[PDB]
Amino acid sequence: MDAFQGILKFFLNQKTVIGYSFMALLTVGSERLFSVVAFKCPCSTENMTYGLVFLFAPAWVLLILGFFLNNRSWRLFTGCCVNPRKIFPRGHSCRFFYVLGQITLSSLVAPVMWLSVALLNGTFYECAMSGTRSSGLLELICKGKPKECWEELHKVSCGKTSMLPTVNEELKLSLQAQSQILGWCLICSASFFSLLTTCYARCRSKVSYLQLSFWKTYAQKEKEQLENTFLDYANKLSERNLKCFFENKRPDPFPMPTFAAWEAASELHSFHQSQQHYSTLHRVVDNG
Amino acid sequence: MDAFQGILKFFLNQKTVIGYSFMALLTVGSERLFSVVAFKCPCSTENMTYGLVFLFAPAWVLLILGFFLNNRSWRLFTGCCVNPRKIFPRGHSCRFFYVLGQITLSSLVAPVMWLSVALLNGTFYECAMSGTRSSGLLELICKGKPKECWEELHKVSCGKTSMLPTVNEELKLSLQAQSQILGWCLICSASFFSLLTTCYARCRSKVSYLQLSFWKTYAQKEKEQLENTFLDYANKLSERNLKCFFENKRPDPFPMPTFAAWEAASELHSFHQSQQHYSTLHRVVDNG
Amino acid sequence: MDAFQGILKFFLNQKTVIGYSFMALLTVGSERLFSVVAFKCPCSTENMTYGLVFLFAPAWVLLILGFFLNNRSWRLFTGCCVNPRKIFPRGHSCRFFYVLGQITLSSLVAPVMWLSVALLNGTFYECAMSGTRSSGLLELICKGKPKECWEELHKVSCGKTSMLPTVNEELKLSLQAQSQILGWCLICSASFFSLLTTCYARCRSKVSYLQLSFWKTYAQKEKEQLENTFLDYANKLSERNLKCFFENKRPDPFPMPTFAAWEAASELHSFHQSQQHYSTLHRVVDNG
Amino acid sequence: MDAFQGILKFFLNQKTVIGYSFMALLTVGSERLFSVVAFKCPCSTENMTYGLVFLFAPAWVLLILGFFLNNRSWRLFTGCCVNPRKIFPRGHSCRFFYVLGQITLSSLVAPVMWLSVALLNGTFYECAMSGTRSSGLLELICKGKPKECWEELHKVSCGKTSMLPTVNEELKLSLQAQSQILGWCLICSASFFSLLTTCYARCRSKVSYLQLSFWKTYAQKEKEQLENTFLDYANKLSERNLKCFFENKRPDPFPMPTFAAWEAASELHSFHQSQQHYSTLHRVVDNG
């Protein structure tokens, strides 16, 4: 009875850590299927292009897919060209870049978690670094190797090289270990940067921790009560419009908010501690 | 009890992302059945025609199938030739191309997801590029290859070539990697174009985000109340016609909307912020 | 009936020892997957960097992840730059370092439990100590070994050495046993330090054991009653704001605490035995 | 019906013998995983240090872990430095060492049960005794053995010895049998010492067997009544503090015990047969 109503409280409270644990568990299973089934490195001069597309192009698709599912990116841009000065208020001319910077950093999580799993499985970097064709970065790999390392390097993945094939097995291990070092430098420097910008946004907040816990509770059920007021006023408007069509009647007037009140309740909210309002709908009711 | 009435809320809300995830999971399993069971490349002079038909003809079938299932393409064209000026209003003469462009771009999703999975499995491009017979694009494939690369290229898929059969294994890998580069160029440039036209359509909207959320709620249950009014007036009309046939009576008059009211409620809706009407049935009731 | 209501009492009472037993059971299964599936030591001159990154970089990620999930690190830092003297009171100028020292030692548990399991499975230390290149610490390993121990030491993991390959099997055992001795010195000296600072914090407490048991019961259900007062005052504020918007009314006044009362209830609590208060909200009510 | 309410009486009554049977079943399964999966003896000069750490370091961790889980070690030390003379009463100046001696001997059970199972599986002692390097205790092992027993003894675990390898099988059996004799001498002398100090503490008791059975029944449900009086007085204090914050009222006074009564009920109890009190809370109520 109460055993099932006591575990769902502890699960719904920790809901922002199972969403990230599921986003990281799907990238691991998707990277162990692109390299096993679809990736096979050609031993040609297109080595640099072929390995640099299986690395960065699945990270570009996940960036655009995070702008589609972000519900507060359509809340900001819808109706922009009607009056472009309602997103740029004259009192706070810099909150547009704070919100737009919050959309970008929130959708960079899945590109970063793709570039780290793909670098901790060093099959894409080994195919890409073999076709380097550069003066620098080639003496580092071919340090104590024979004279034909500077030309037959881009064949080391397929074997197929007349260079005593146990040097080909220790030229693969030197490239499969330069990517796993780079794969850990990306997790360590993106976790530190994600904590440095989160703590700076909370240290510079306008309210303390107790008022911020009421602000999040009000903003979560102002949207639940909005879905029930829209759904109740739409059942009464469609019943008025369908009885005056089949019976050829004249309708009673239907009171609705005007266009000036619809656009004034859609502006961007910024907290003021002199008159403490918790939403932009709270501000237009208390002022009018 | 309430655990089953709390997961279906989170599933029906995210309903436009499981439909596209099911459309992408069916194209993958359909492309891995044509190339395994039905496709076998002939090593002939019909190499170009055979591989270019398994690429573009299953994408032409899915384009027409997206016009049959689009419910707002029959809402626009039914009764066109009675009065063609009800689709071309004189106030807004350009909305006909906005609606027609929305039909085309919404049915181009499944052709694009076919050409990407087919190019990421490079069996159709390798059979097609072998029979190119062109001056350009033939020196790129036969760069460091012997003299009989310019004539025996169209046999490389079947083997069957007296050209030292390890060059035939590195001419297959060079063609199976030019299609996977081209496959990622299509996903990366169609995901960017799909976001550029969706964001431009919302930035140029007439209403803000809050009024657009009531417009979508009213339009969803105006169709639900329309199906219950049609089903209620058809049960009363069929009972009147059947009692006056078997008993040879004369019927009472049945009030129904006239022909001029049926055609006025079927026009194309366009929002005006001076008189805010949320449908074209709402406009003919409030005006008459 | 009462059999299920008698074991959940004994499980929820011992709740701080199943969270640590689950934190230690997940580190063991995560370390037996990095060394088996992903770690393969190269026999090169990058031996020192490769083995020292698989040791300390997964312990840097778990340190930052313990600052995110700590609920009393945001309770201290939110709203810091509005008035920085509310975290540094003039009466108790040193409690800021007692709370900050409690956040750090509580999040150092999972880094320490990573470095112990990684040293009791001596694969990361064997790859890293082989590339030592130092005057000291090299005569200890190469004590009764031949002359080529001082140059071909970094190849001992891959084999591949012309040094009579049964000396290569007793040079691996001498390095796989110097890490397991260091793995037990870390558990034995972190368990003694975790008891010395816990017993010193309780011996220097202001209240005895009986008053401290009431303090923990009050602080546990002041948070439960706070979540039900926030959820009740937010259902009444959103109902007031949505009836005055759709009907264009003027609202009744809504009594709420002022901004000066919100910030005084968010300060840092310190016990005084002259006037015994159990929270900072209890102190501002009894004083005003 | 009553079949389940008649076996749980016989199980909860014998609760101090299933806790020790489960503590001993976990040490056996934990010692058969260290010596099988993680222990591999090097044949080097670090034989003494390697085998003496796998023996005594898991016994030092279990000693500190028995101070953390002992609920009457925090009952004694919390608030010690406020007034140190409440743990050292002038009438009974030696009860502090009786309680501290009861904490130490009750947490030595799991260290002793580790050293006995680890010595009845003679793998740790065989690795450590091979590197003895002593004048005594080496003639006992090398009694009827050849001349190279005094130098090649520390290699006997790995084999690897040119000493007619059937003498290497009877030097392992002589060291794997000196530890099992030492393993049984530890269980025989710790079971006799545990009965000798338990019977001496009960023979020197102040009450007889019948009064001691009421004392254990009262002390067991003074703690159950204390958890319900704390949980009832904390629900009334948090409701008073939250209604005077959101409504800006002034509160009624809340009667609570003073600081002098909180510390007098936290002292150390000792029985007196002149005025028979069964707790230290029973003493301060009957006296005041």
UniProtKB/Swiss-Prot annotation, chains A, B, C, D:
Residues 1-15, 71-99, 201-288 are cytoplasmic. Coiled coil: none annotated. The chain crosses the membrane at residues 16-37, 46-70, 100-129, 175-200. It is a multi-pass membrane protein. Keywords: Disulfide bond, Ion channel, Ion transport, Membrane, Transmembrane, Transmembrane helix, Transport. Disulfide bonds join 41-127, 43-158, 142-149. The keyword Transmembrane helix applies. GO terms for biological process: ATP export. GO terms for molecular function: monoatomic cation channel activity. Residues 38-45, 130-174 are extracellular. GO terms for cellular component: plasma membrane. It is found in: Membrane. A 1,2-diacyl-sn-glycero-3-phosphate binds at residues 15, 32, 37, 102, 121, 202. Oligomerizes to form undecameric cone-shaped channels. May assemble to form large pore channels with gating and ion conductance likely regulated by membrane lipids. Belongs to the CALHM family. PANTHER family: CALCIUM HOMEOSTASIS MODULATOR PROTEIN, CALCIUM HOMEOSTASIS MODULATOR PROTEIN 5. This is Calcium homeostasis modulator protein 5. It comes from Homo sapiens (Human). The gene is CALHM5.
